């Protein structure tokens, strides 16, 4: 910044700002910040709207900091405004904060926080990192149980390396960019795997397929790895829980992207006279949201009556004692899409 005295043109140089484009999407990563960082105050959540706004905060860029190489790889891939929260006060600020859809362990250990923070009632989907050491087929039972089995988290193992950085780059940095770059392009219901990594990011450790056969079962660890045709890409779409209800992240992330957009679609119903004309104004405010989600290919099926259902009413879902307690119970069902993980190729030699 130069002071301006005369009206005209100023030719002042500024070497190597490493400038990225501003982006707009609907995915807001709370970034965990280690306590030894100085340009953060605790019990406070500062907001970073673009890479120039982070670079205004820290002053100048250095590739030593585990946070500085983290938010560059975030804004190089997906962008979108992010919240930088220090770790020791992250349990107070995330329930405070609205616009929180995914909590990113930048380079820190959040496994004690996610157990109390991520709940079925909330709307978060945390992501954190695998081990930064190499792990083999033999150590498949040890590092798999180092994480909890909640269906609201995803683990990406191979830490990144880039030519512009010195410390290894943690993969939950880039995977919050990928979650925000895929939701804009292909929507939420498509899997955030099988997509390229921009910004010159490269995996540290080469992963074989026979290694990934043991980290996909149970408490799964998704992995990124480079291929010959396209380069480095994400190659996992499994959450930690291995029940069929929440096995894939696109199922868990759609139901979390539905609820945050239903509860703002029918937030007019608060403190309204609780009778019947409030109810059909509620079942119609949900039903032409889900139909607009139905036509874009977000739910599976072929009709609108195999796709979803909204059923409310006195006696259908709520009792008379629930009316004078001030409760409107709503039952909504969905049928999302599942991805195709495996493709097998049968090679007959004799053509008929």
């Amino acid at each position: 910044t130069t002071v301006t005295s005369y009206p005209g043109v100023y030719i002042e140089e500024l070497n190597s700002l490493a400038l990225s484009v501003s982006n707009s999407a609907t995915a807001v990563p709370v970034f965990a910040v280690d306590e030894q960082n100085q340009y953060i105050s605790e019990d406070n959540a500062i907001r970073i709207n673009s890479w120039m706004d982070y670079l205004n905060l820290i002053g100048n860029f250095n590739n030593e900091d585990k946070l500085d190489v983290s938010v560059r790889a975030y804004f190089a891939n997906g962008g979108g405004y992010c919240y930088l929260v220090k770790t020791t006060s992250l349990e107070k600020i995330i329930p405070t904060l609205d616009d929180v859809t995914l909590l990113v362990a930048a380079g820190e250990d959040i496994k004690t926080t996610v157990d109390v923070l991520c709940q079925p009632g909330k709307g978060l989907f945390a992501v954190f990192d695998g081990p930064e050491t190499e792990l083999t087929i033999n150590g498949a039972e040890e590092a798999k149980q180092a994480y909890t089995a909640t269906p609201f988290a995803a683990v990406y193992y191979p830490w990144l390396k880039a030519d512009w950085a010195n410390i290894d780059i943690p993969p939950s940095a880039v995977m919050a960019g990928v979650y925000a770059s895929v939701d804009l392009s292909r929507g939420v219901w498509k899997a955030p795997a099988n997509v390229a990594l921009k910004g010159g990011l490269e995996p540290k450790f080469l992963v074989t397929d026979e290694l990934q056969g043991e980290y996909n079962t149970g408490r799964a660890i998704n992995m990124i790895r480079n291929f010959s045709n396209t380069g480095t890409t994400v190659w996992g779409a499994r959450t930690l829980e291995d029940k069929d209800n929440w096995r894939y992240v696109p199922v868990r992330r759609l139901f979390n992207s539905v609820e945050r957009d239903i509860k703002r679609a029918m937030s007019f119903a608060m403190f309204e006279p609780n009778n019947q004309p409030t109810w059909e104004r509620v079942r119609a405010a949900i039903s032409n949201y889900l139909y607009s989600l139905w036509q874009q290919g977000g739910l599976a099926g072929s009709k609108e009556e195999d796709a979803y259902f909204v059923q409310i009413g006195k006696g259908i879902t709520m009792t008379q004692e629930q009316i004078d307690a001030g409760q409107m119970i709503v039952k909504v069902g969905l049928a999302a899409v599942r991805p195709a993980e495996f493709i097998i190729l049968q090679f007959t030699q004799d053509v008929e």
Binding site: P277, E280, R281
Partner: protein, 50 residues
């Protein structure tokens, strides 16, 4: 063979009518809200009551 199939869905424009009131100006600020390309589109629910 006289095959008949229904084709394209045809457009829908409804026409709903209201007397003016001395303070309330509600329908005009919806037809005034339109600049070039977009309006704030709303949804209408009509319902026969008790």
């Amino acid at each position: 063979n006289w095959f008949k199939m229904p084709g394209q869905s045809q457009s829908t424009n409804i026409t709903l009518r209201k007397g003016v009131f001395p303070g309330k100006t509600e329908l005009f600020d919806w037809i005034n809200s339109i600049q070039l390309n977009q309006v704030e589109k709303k949804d209408i629910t009509i319902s026969l009551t008790n």
